[PDB]
C-alpha cells in the first residue's frame, strides 16, 4: 500500500517493468519479450526505479 | 579466504558513493567472466548494487568496501561488508531486504558488535545466486 | 592501504595460471575507466599482465595475487605481488625486465626474505605510468 | 643478437609490430597508422609476440 503512490510516481514503462519483475516474478529476459525491449534495457529500468525507490523508503 | 573456490575474486576499495560506479563495471566484467543463467545474473548485478551503495552510504570514515565474488559451479556468492554505522544496513521487513530476497536465491548477513575496533562496526551480507 | 587514492581498487585471486585472463579482464576495465593517455594504458596492460604471468608461473601452492591499481590524476600506480619461489622474479637485465622498464615510466620490486612464514616469500613489482 | 634469430621466428607482422615498439620507441598509435592497421590489432600482436618471447628467454 505504501508502494502504491510511490509506484504510480514511477514513469510509465519503469512501473510496468517494476511490477513485472517483483509481483509477476518474471525473469527480466521475459519482460524484456513481454515489453518488447531489449534485455539490457530491461536492467536499465530496473536499476533506475530501484534507486528512485530506495531513497523514498 | 580459504573456503572460496579457485576462480573467486576478493575486489577492495574505499566504501565512497563516488566508486559504485566502478563497482558495478567491475562486478558486470565478471559475470560476463562467467556461466549461469544470464537472467541470474543480471538479478544478481542489481542486488550486489544495492547490497554496495546501502553499505556505502552506512559506511565510517575511512571505511573499506570488501567484496568477494566466489563463481562455483553450482552458484554464485557474493559477499559484501565495510564498517558501518548501524548494526543492520537491511533490517528485516524493510525494502532492501524484500528487495535482495527477490533478487538472490538465499542472502544472509553477519556482524558481531562485541569485536573491539573497527571489526565489531563490520556489516556483512552475501548474496547466493544457483543455476 | 591508506597512502593509495581514493579511486584505488585492490584485487586478490588465487595465483594460479588459470586466474591471469580474469585478471586481464578486470585490468582492462579499470583503465577505460580511467583518464590517463591512452597510449599510456595500452602499455601499462600488457606491463601488468606480464607482472602477473610472471608471479603467477613463480608462485608457491596456495599463493595469492594481489594486485592494487591506483588511478591518481597524475599517474597510475600499479603494484602486484604474490608468495614466490624465488627471490627476484623479473632479474636486471632478463628480457622481462627490459619490457617492464620500455612500458612504464618507472619499474621498482620490493622482497624481504628476512620476515618469517609467507611474507619472507613475497615478491612484488610497481608499475608507474604518467601523463 | 639473441633475440635477433627469435624475432626471424616470429610471424612477419608480428615482428614489425614489437620493433617498432620496443626499437623504434613509437606509441601503439603510432604503429598502428605505420601499418595501417587498428590500435586494438597492434595491443593483440605485442601481447601475442611478448607471450612468445617471454617462453624463449
Known amino acids: 500500500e505504501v508502494l502504491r503512490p510511490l509506484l504510480e510516481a514511477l514513469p510509465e514503462r519503469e512501473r510496468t517493468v517494476l511490477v513485472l519483475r517483483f509481483f509477476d516474478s518474471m525473469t527480466q529476459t521475459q519482460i524484456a519479450e513481454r515489453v518488447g525491449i531489449s534485455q539490457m534495457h530491461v536492467s536499465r529500468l530496473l536499476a533506475k526505479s530501484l534507486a528512485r525507490l530506495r531513497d523514498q523508503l | ?131
Chains 1, 4 share one sequence.
Open chain 2, 1 to 131: 579466504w580459504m573456503q572460496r573456490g579457485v576462480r573467486a575474486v576478493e575486489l577492495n576499495v574505499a566504501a565512497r558513493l563516488e566508486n559504485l560506479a566502478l563497482l558495478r563495471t567491475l562486478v558486470g566484467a565478471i559475470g560476463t567472466f562467467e556461466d549461469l543463467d544470464f537472467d541470474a545474473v543480471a538479478d544478481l548485478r542489481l542486488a550486489v548494487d544495492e547490497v554496495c551503495t546501502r553499505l556505502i552510504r552506512s559506511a565510517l570514515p575511512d571505511a573499506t568496501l570488501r567484496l568477494v565474488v566466489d563463481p562455483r559451479k553450482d552458484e554464485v556468492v557474493v559477499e559484501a561488508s565495510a564498517a558501518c554505522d548501524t548494526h543492520d544496513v537491511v533490517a528485516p521487513g524493510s525494502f532492501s531486504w524484500h528487495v535482495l530476497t527477490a533478487l538472490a536465491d538465499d542472502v544472509q548477513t553477519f556482524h558481531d558488535g562485541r569485536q573491539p575496533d573497527v571489526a565489531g562496526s563490520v556489516f556483512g551480507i552475501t548474496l547466493t545466486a544457483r543455476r
